[PDB]
Write a protein that binds this ligand. Structure first.
Ligand code: CLA
Ligand code: CLA
Ligand code: CLA
Ligand code: CLA
Ligand code: CLA
Ligand code: CLA
Ligand code: CLA
Ligand code: CLA
Ligand SMILES: CCCCCCCCCCCCCCCC(=O)OC[C@H](COP(=O)(O)OC[C@@H](O)CO)OC(=O)CCCCCCCCCCCCCCC
Ligand SMILES: CC1=C(/C=C/C(C)=C/C=C/C(C)=C/C=C\C=C(C)/C=C/C=C(C)/C=C/C2=C(C)C[C@H](O)CC2(C)C)C(C)(C)C[C@H](O)C1
Ligand SMILES: CC(C)[C@H](C)/C=C/[C@H](C)[C@H]1CC[C@@H]2C3=CC=C4C[C@@H](O)CC[C@]4(C)[C@@H]3CC[C@@]21C
Lengths: 173, 38, 80, 155, 743, 179
């Protein structure tokens, strides 16, 4: 009955109205876990992965003269900025923004979607359209970036080359 | 035929959780052996 | 020579008399419960202290209390 | 008195003794064959372990001694692991307490205790990542400590 | 005449997981919810007690047939595991090349927390934990030469386990036999005597004649295991068997012509141990299996089943009657056909006795090759079978008491042997108690007297060879008769059954395999100690079984049940009065008796049998003749055996045996933890739990399942379990470390 | 003679199975459906048929071309040496990774659904090209039966391929061309 898998049934918790509904859930994670919390988790995982992807793409071409030459590699750069103290400052302003966007309902048992939808954490400065088309485009690009970031960081783990540096004159393993 | 409920019983859930905990501890101990004074 | 004492919280369920193996307890008329009966211990000389009655009492706190005191041939359960 | 293990002759003597113990058994085997590689990995691990422990303090016996007085210089020795342990066990205790409080609201809490409700159990386990903050506000609201409990004769 | 027919019920029980989510479904009381923590313990305590679940014998019989299949499947999985470990993680081929130099090992420890040191340099390239289970010797005796056969055997075992799984499920959810089935004791006995044992021994004899005999003959002739022909080649090409054994040239014709004497090349009765490997001659073993198979097959046609010919067990039982036994064995047939507890008691006692006999016969006459030279394996096997036998014996007594309390019937047991025994149970127990007192005094008092004499410097007044002598003249005489049997009472036997009785010593690989075990005053005293301990433990068990229903202290123990805590603080005190408590005490006494028995075997073997032999025949034991004068005093038993031999288990740290040392300490802890549950009562723990519960209440973290202390009976069970576990583990680690470090 | 009911054997009493796609043979001489679920066995048979058809065609196709970037030092496709070398170079390790992913994430749910009586055994709804037509109608039941027969033949032919190669140390085409 599920659109993605016509041999299995659509999970009872999922619904077509929410953005990105393909009925793809063979392991039935929607069951045993709140549909709204899982949806919010997908939204934020995608947003954070999208930003991470842009970091890896624009890190090849360094643009911050204050920090000068950096390792440019995932592990080495993370370790370098963690020892430099900038990562402790980066961890900050994120948890603060998490406590601000959620209005204090950071915990899974506290978070309640009263008068909102999973992902509607304010942050609409331009007041652009928020219809289901834009929400579906958001979740789709978020999934594409969730997969892309993982592939990019894994490539950096095995090859050590940057994404666009690895795409050219591709080398097999 | 409610297998999920049985899998959710105290002995099964406890053994699964302790198995995962022990596995995590062991995996951490081979990847990071002889860990002391953090 | 154990002392068996019945308290006012007895509900007259007779379980103590039914569980006593030495015919030490019995049921007597009473007006402290709807059952109209209360446990009595008029043959405490035959008691041995097994406390089967204490175990068979349903009240919150045992309404029948057996106190182990003087020891005699009957109380020691000696067939020799 | 205590001196750094890197500057103590006992530490180096122990390292050499362990390496010798491994090499004695390693000599019996052949370079490239089952075993002999198994002992070489052990020797390398011994070298790394001693180089790692060289920063610790040890006396005459050469065994690394851990200072728990609370000195900041030795925070990594006991302070940091102590705080991390308290965090992990406070998380365990807080999630367990919340699960019990939820089960008591069901029709038959005993059945929930025997057959754990994986959904709600996981709901409370995933949460609580800020248990130190959740412990407070529960205490301030008065929802943590009780007032009257079971007490026997002679309270 | 009764038709021995099979009747079954189809789809009697549905196959579903619905009952899996309801723990305690098998019990009416346990299906109402826990309400306390005692329900968790009661759920497991009454899980396998099928007689308490339902009152129908048919259901219990089905629940037993199944679950027997499950245990058979569990045993097959364990066997498959042993074979797979031998094929994948063991130095079996290397051991075959050099059986005396290579130490058996089939376990490889992962390198994670420094435990890689446990991989001892057993040789053969691989390094692992030395196994003392005798798996290598057994496989060699079976003809295994390559690991491919071990892999195939492991796969076959897994398949057999799957079959025993399917059979167990099928005989409970697809075809459950009725009570008429399972009550056909004549048919069950005929089949088990002629098919399970008779045909089994016959098939094993055939395998030995066609696989074990030729392969082992070539192995003992200096042929490499890889160059030996495959087992199937010896069957297809008869020329090879003829060359190795000319008797095969005649074929099966001599068997059918009664010219059995032509099989003197394969069916021998040499009698002694092989001087090349130190074990029994495989030809004598094959001939033995053939004779035991023919004897069991003939015995399997005694009872009457679906035909006129045969015998009726009930008729035979009722026929045996005498003046001193009014009704004889009348009513026993109905007892053994209507109560599984009685059958389990008899079978457990016999199985335990059989295990003990197996231990004795296996050490005295090493059946497998190179088994005697591997002292670690010898010690482990004797001690292991001795312990399993003792446990099964105590279980036999426990089940006898269970039957007596629950399945006993006065009408069935009327004026018969059982009723007549219960009538004079006081004479039985008082006379047996008197025997126990006499044995303890004349056994332990001799040891105490020797301690007092040696401490006073009065060695001339001791019970030793130099001083007052107590020689086992009867046992020594039997040994001499056995020594002379191969020529005056065993005409066709070429050597004594066991070299432990006399004859000459056997040395394999510069190690003693089996030499005469001379008995002296020390053996006299130790054997009497063994008899004393056996008498006290049997007294405890017999007392518990005879008084299980009633006694002069508690006139209705049966109504109270078989497993109840006590009748209260009345009649002076009735603690541990139930039969279950008698089994609880018998466990400690059996442990004491068995511990002393294994101690005697270990010390005597290491001081007078196990050892090395230098060129020219010079013999040097592990502990040179110290048992003769050191085993006669408790101080010697503590200094020359417990202290001197423990140095190997305490100094094992830093080597591959360190694990044993660790287990040596852990066991102690457990043995000391048991004391907690044995010298304490649940009233105190309940009060402590009350205070802890108040602390929990003060934080709104109290559990719905009211925490309760362990039951009185459960506390006793936990205490005895920990005591036995700790003691047996301590002596296990001590025995294994001592025998592996030296010898 | 025979019994009251018949089976294609012509000497057997029909089992529980009746007339299923490709099951007109009712080939169950040994009781397998009387104790085990029919859906479970059907799912297993269809899974075997599919993996075996791919294996047969794969063995024949591998003997013509090896892509030139895979060592393939052994020209025997069903030989342990080729299996081990391809496992070491990571090709078969990756096939195992993704095949196990499919079985756990999708195969297990599919079998559970078919065991509960919802999904037809071996029905994954994969019909890119309308070759079978509408489900449960003409061109589908017949095609399903054809799939079953082709799969059974492929299973028997895969067993033959492996045994022949292991005994002659020659490929399928090589053995067909010579002796
Ligand atoms: C490797 C790829 C990957 C994948 C597959 C996931 C998947 C997931 N993440 Mg994660 N994430 C990742 C990378 C990934 N993440 C990385 C690299 C980071 C750091 C930048 C994060 C940071 C992150 C955060 C901060 C959180 C998640 C959360 C989640 C879950 C969201 C679903 C939900 O809301 O309900 C939950 C669905 C479940 C199936 C429960 C998960 C199962 C157990 C209970 C989790 C922990 C058990 C473990 C033994 C505890 C030890 C410590 C742990 C850190 C390993 C989901 C299972 C959220 C979450 O966990 O929900 C509370 C959330 O807190 N992610
Ligand atoms: C359950 C146990 C068991 C099992 C399963 C087997 C199984 C087997 N045994 Mg065996 N065996 C066993 C126990 C067992 N044995 C025992 C306890 C003994 C006594 C110690 C023997 C002694 C024995 C011998 C000596 C031989 C076998 C052989 C065999 C194999 C073929 C038997 C046969 O039919 O040849 C039949 C052989 C005959 C001679 C038939 C007798 C009557 C013929 C028809 C005479 C008429 C004349 C005719 C021209 C044949 C000339 C034969 C002459 C030249 C010998 C077979 C696989 C034979 C074998 O294959 O060797 C590897 C073999 O020779 N067994
Ligand atoms: C239960 C907790 C647990 C956890 C958290 C891990 C975590 C990890 N394991 Mg591990 N493992 C475990 C239990 C666990 N394992 C157990 C019980 C075994 C069997 C003894 C193994 C055997 C194992 C091997 C052989 C390897 C790992 C490896 C790894 C790392 C690979 C990366 C990864 O994310 O995979 C996550 C993995 C898991 C969450 C566990 C999945 C284990 C499955 C069953 C695979 C094992 C297959 C086994 C060989 C054969 C059948 C086993 C049977 C249980 C079905 C990793 C972080 C790899 C490594 O070393 O990294 C370089 C590797 O080679 N594990
Ligand atoms: C919800 C779980 C839970 C929580 C929050 C607590 C909390 C507390 N316990 Mg307690 N305890 C527990 C379970 C728990 N306990 C269990 C299962 C047992 C039986 C073994 C005990 C036995 C126990 C004793 C004997 C004592 C305490 C005491 C205490 C208090 C002081 C700390 C301590 O000594 O802990 C000690 C902890 C243990 C001895 C073992 C804990 C068992 C496991 C490892 C943790 C529980 C896991 C639980 C199943 C998780 C559920 C998760 C849910 C989401 C499904 C503290 C308030 C002390 C006290 O009286 O207060 C001053 C005290 O003396 N506890
Ligand atoms: C010659 C026929 C025969 C044989 C060989 C056996 C053998 C056995 N019986 Mg059995 N029995 C038989 C006839 C037979 N029985 C008959 C006719 C009856 C009815 C009167 C019974 C009633 C009976 C009961 C009530 C029980 C046994 C049990 C056992 C097992 C005892 C456990 C053991 O010692 O482990 C040894 C195990 C082995 C050596 C492995 C061998 C196993 C194979 C499959 C041989 C058994 C063949 C089997 C009897 C018939 C096959 C049926 C066919 C339709 C497949 C053993 C395998 C006990 C048991 O364990 O339950 C399962 C038990 O509870 N039997
Ligand atoms: C073929 C052998 C056999 C069989 C079939 C049975 C069968 C039975 N026994 Mg029996 N018994 C046996 C041998 C056997 N016993 C032996 C050898 C002994 C002496 C030890 C006893 C002593 C005995 C007693 C005293 C009682 C029974 C009882 C029972 C009945 C219920 C069992 C139950 O539900 O408890 C459930 C079983 C458990 C909860 C498991 C307990 C685990 C113990 C401590 C063993 C631990 C072993 C393990 C190696 C420890 C190390 C690992 C550890 C670190 C985890 C049942 C019909 C009981 C009965 O009749 O009901 C009134 C009863 O009271 N048995
Ligand atoms: C080796 C012997 C031994 C041991 C170890 C103990 C241990 C203990 N006794 Mg004790 N006791 C003993 C003998 C022993 N007793 C004897 C002979 C008596 C006379 C009857 C008493 C009478 C007694 C009383 C009256 C009291 C105690 C109390 C206690 C507890 C005190 C609090 C504590 O330290 O907790 C710490 C825990 C430990 C020391 C145990 C170690 C931790 C274990 C090994 C971890 C869990 C198991 C582990 C996972 C391995 C098993 C795995 C499984 C698969 C098998 C403690 C558990 C008091 C108490 O209840 O405290 C609140 C109490 O009031 N005991
Ligand atoms: C994995 C192999 C396999 C499996 C699982 C099945 C399963 C099934 N088949 Mg099928 N079949 C197969 C192979 C298999 N088949 C082959 C190769 C030809 C056929 C021809 C065939 C026909 C014509 C029909 C079936 C039918 C069926 C279904 C009902 C009958 C049944 O339960 O048989 C179960 C069979 C098994 C579970 C396989 C195990 C059998 C043994 C133990 C395996 C060993 C066999 C071995 C290779 C033989 C060596 C011979 C040698 C000694 C000479 C069922 C779903 C009937 C149907 O209704 O179709 C829907 C039907 O009409 N089969
Ligand atoms: C006296 C010659 C035997 C030497 C002693 C060792 C014999 C071993 C058998 C043990 C039982 C003792 C034999 C008499 C027993 C005997 O066979 O008597 C004969 C009698 C059996 O004859 P019935 O006429 O009853 O036969 C009908 C039934 O047996 C049907 O089969 O048994 C009894 O009824 C009494 C049973 C025990 C009577 C109490 C004696 C207990 C003492 C146990 C210690 C024995 C001595 C220890 C060794 C020194
Ligand atoms: C929310 C909102 C706004 C929107 C704000 C933001 C932040 C929008 C989106 C930002 C970012 C950074 C990313 C969005 C999507 C990112 C995607 C889809 C990245 C995908 C990565 C992929 C597919 C990786 C690809 C590869 C792989 C995996 C391997 C590499 O070897 C090479 C390579 C082929 C490149 C604004 C406009 C600011 C104001 C107001 O309107 C509110
Ligand atoms: C595992 C295979 C190899 C063997 C042959 C299986 C045989 C199964 C169990 C079947 C086949 C025919 C028998 C069979 C005939 C008819 C049926 C109907 C059905 O209600 C199942 C039982 C039942 C009454 C029995 C079960 C037992 C048998 C023997």
């Amino acid at each position: 009955q599920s659109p993605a898998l016509p041999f299995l049934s659509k999970p009872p918790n999922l619904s077509p109205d929410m953005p990105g509904y393909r009925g793809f859930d063979p392991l039935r994670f929607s069951d045993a876990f709140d549909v709204n919390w899982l949806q919010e988790g997908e939204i934020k995982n995608g947003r954070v992965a999208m930003l991470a992807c842009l970091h890896f793409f624009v890190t090849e071409f360094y643009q911050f003269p204050f920090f000068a030459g950096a390792p440019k590699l995932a592990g080495p750069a993370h370790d370098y900025f963690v020892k430099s103290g900038a990562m402790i400052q980066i961890l900050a302003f994120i948890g603060f923004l998490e406590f601000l966007l959620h209005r204090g309902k950071v915990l899974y048992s506290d978070m309640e979607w009263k008068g909102r939808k999973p992902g509607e954490l304010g942050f609409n400065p331009l007041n652009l359209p928020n219809d289901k088309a834009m929400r579906d485009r958001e979740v789709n690009n978020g999934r594409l970036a969730m997969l892309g970031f993982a592939g990019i960081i894994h490539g950096e783990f095995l090859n050590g080359k940057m994404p666009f540096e690895q795409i050219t004159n591709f080398q097999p393993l | 035929m409610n297998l999920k409920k049985y899998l959710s019983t105290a002995p099964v859930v406890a053994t699964l959780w302790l198995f995962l905990t022990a596995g995590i501890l062991i995996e951490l101990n081979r990847f990071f052996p002889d860990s002391l004074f953090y | 020579a154990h002392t068996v004492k019945i308290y006012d919280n007895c509900i007259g369920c007779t379980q103590c008399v039914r569980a006593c193996p030495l015919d030490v307890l019995e049921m007597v008329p009473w007006d402290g419960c709807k059952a109209g009966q209360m446990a009595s211990a008029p043959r405490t000389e035959d008691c041995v202290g097994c406390k089967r009655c204490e175990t068979a009492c349903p009240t919150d706190f045992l309404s029948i209390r057996v106190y182990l005191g003087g020891e005699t041939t009957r109380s020691m359960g000696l067939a020799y | 008195v205590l001196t750094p293990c890197q500057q103590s002759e006992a530490f180096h003597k122990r390292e050499i003794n362990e390496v010798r113990t491994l090499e004695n058994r390693q000599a019996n085997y052949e370079a490239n064959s089952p075993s002999y590689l198994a002992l070489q990995s052990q020797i390398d691990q011994v070298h790394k372990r001693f180089d790692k422990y060289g920063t610790l303090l040890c006396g005459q016996d050469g065994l690394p001694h851990l200072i728990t007085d609370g000195d900041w210089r030795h925070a990594r020795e006991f302070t940091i692991p102590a705080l991390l342990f308290l965090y992990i066990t406070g998380w365990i205790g807080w999630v367990g307490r919340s699960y019990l409080k939820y089960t008591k609201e069901t029709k038959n809490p005993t059945e929930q205790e025997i057959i754990l409700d994986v959904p709600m159990a996981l709901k409370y386990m995933l949460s609580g990542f800020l248990w130190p903050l959740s412990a407070w506000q529960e205490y301030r609201s008065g929802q943590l400590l009780a007032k009257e409990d079971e007490i026997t004769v002679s309270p | 005449e009764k038709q021995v027919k099979v009747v079954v019920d189809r789809d009697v029980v549905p196959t579903s997981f619905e009952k899996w989510a309801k723990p305690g479904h098998f019990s009416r009381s346990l299906a109402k919810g826990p309400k306390t923590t005692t329900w968790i313990w009661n759920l497991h305590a009454d899980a396998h007690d099928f007689d308490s679940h339902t009152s129908s014998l048919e259901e219990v019989s089905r629940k037993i047939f199944s679950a027997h299949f499950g245990q058979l499947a569990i045993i097959f999985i364990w066997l498959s595991g042993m074979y797979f470990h031998g094929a994948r993680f063991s130095n079996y081929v290397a051991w075959l090349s050099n059986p005396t130099g290579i130490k058996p090992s089939a376990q490889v420890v992962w390198p994670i927390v420094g435990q890689q040191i446990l991989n001892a340099d057993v040789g053969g390239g691989m390094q692992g934990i030395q196994i003392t289970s005798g798996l290598f010797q057994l496989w060699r005796a079976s003809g295994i030469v390559n690991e491919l056969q071990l892999y195939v055997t492991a796969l076959g075992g897994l398949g057999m386990a799957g079959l025993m799984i399917f059979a167990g499920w099928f005989h409970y959810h697809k075809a459950a036999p009725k009570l008429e089935w399972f009550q056909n004791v004549e048919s069950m006995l005929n089949h088990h005597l002629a098919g399970l044992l008779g045909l089994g021994s016959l098939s094993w004899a055939g395998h030995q004649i066609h696989v074990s005999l030729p392969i082992n003959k070539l192995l003992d002739a200096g042929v490499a295991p890889s160059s030996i022909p495959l087992p199937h080649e010896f069957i297809l090409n008869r020329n090879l068997m003829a060359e190795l054994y000319p008797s095969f040239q005649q074929g099966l014709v001599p068997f059918f012509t009664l010219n059995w004497k032509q099989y003197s090349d394969i069916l021998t009765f040499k009698g002694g141990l092989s001087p090349v490997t130190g074990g029994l001659w495989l030809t004598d073993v094959a001939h033995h299996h053939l004779a035991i198979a023919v004897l069991f097959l003939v015995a399997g046609h005694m009872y009457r089943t679906n035909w006129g010919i045969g015998h009726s067990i009930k008729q035979i039982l009722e026929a045996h009657k005498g003046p001193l036994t009014g009704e004889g064995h009348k009513g026993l047939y109905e007892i053994l056909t209507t109560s599984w507890h009685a059958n389990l008691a008899i079978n457990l006692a016999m199985l335990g006795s059989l295990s003990i006999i197996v231990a004795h016969h296996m050490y005295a006459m090493p059946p497998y090759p190179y088994l005697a030279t591997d002292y670690p394996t010898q010690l482990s096997l004797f001690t292991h079978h001795m312990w399993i036998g003792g446990f099964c014996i105590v279980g036999a007594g426990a089940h006898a008491a269970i039957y007596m309390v629950r399945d006993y019937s006065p009408t069935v047991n009327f004026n018969n042997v059982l009723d007549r025994m219960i009538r004079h149970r006081d004479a039985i127990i008082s006379h047996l108690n008197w025997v126990c007192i006499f044995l303890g005094m004349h056994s332990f008092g001799l040891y105490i007297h020797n301690d007092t004499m040696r401490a006073l410097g009065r060695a001339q007044d001791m019970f030793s060879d130099t001083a007052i002598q107590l020689q086992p003249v009867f046992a020594q005489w039997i040994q001499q008769i056995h020594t002379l049997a191969p020529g005056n009472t065993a005409v066709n036997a070429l050597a004594t059954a066991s070299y432990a009785f006399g004859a000459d010593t056997v040395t394999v690989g510069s190690k003693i395999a089996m030499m005469p075990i001379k008995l002296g005053t020390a053996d006299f005293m130790v054997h009497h100690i063994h008899a004393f301990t056996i008498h006290v433990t049997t007294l405890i068990l017999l007392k518990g079984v005879l008084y299980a229903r009633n006694s002069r202290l508690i006139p209705d123990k049966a109504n109270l049940g078989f497993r109840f805590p006590c009748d209260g603080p009345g009649r002076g005190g009735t603690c541990q009065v139930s039969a279950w408590d008698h089994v609880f005490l018998g466990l400690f006494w059996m442990y004491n008796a068995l511990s002393i028995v294994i101690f005697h075997f270990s010390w005597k073997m290491q001081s007078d049998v196990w050892g090395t032999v230098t060129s020219n025949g010079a013999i040097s034991h592990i502990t040179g003749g110290n048992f003769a004068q050191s085993a006669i005093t408790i101080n010697g038993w503590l200094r020359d055996f417990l202290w001197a031999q423990a140095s190997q288990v305490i100094q094992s740290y830093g080597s591959s045996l360190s694990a044993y040392g660790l287990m040596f300490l852990g066991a102690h802890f457990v043995w000391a933890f048991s004391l907690m549950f044995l010298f304490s009562g649940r009233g105190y723990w309940q009060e402590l739990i009350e205070s802890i519960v108040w602390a929990h209440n003060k934080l709104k973290v109290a559990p719905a399942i009211a925490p309760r202390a362990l039951s009185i009976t459960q506390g006793r069970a936990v205490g005895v379990a920990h005591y036995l576990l700790g003691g047996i583990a301590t002596t296990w680690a001590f025995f294994l470390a001592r025998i592996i470090a030296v010898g | 003679g025979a019994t009251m009911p018949s089976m294609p054997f012509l000497k057997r009493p029909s089992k529980l199975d009746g007339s299923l796609p490709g099951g007109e043979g009712c080939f169950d001489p040994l009781g397998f459906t009387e104790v085990f679920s029919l859906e479970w066995l059907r799912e297993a048979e269809i899974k075997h048929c599919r993996v075996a058809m791919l294996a047969v065609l794969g063995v024949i196709a591998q003997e013509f071309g090896t892509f030139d970037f895979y060592n393939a030092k052994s020209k025997l496709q069903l030989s342990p040496d080729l299996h081990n070398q391809f496992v070491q170079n990571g090709a078969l390790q990756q096939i195992l990774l993704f095949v196990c992913a499919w079985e756990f994430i999708v195969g297990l749910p599919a079998l559970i659904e078919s065991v509960n009586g919802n999904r037809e055994p071996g029905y994954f709804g994969f019909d890119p090209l309308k070759l079978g037509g509408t489900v449960g109608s003409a061109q589908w039941k017949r095609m399903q039966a054809g799939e079953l027969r082709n799969g059974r033949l492929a299973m028997i032919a895969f067993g033959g391929f492996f045994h022949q190669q292991l005994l002659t140390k020659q490929g399928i085409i090589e053995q067909l061309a010579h002796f």
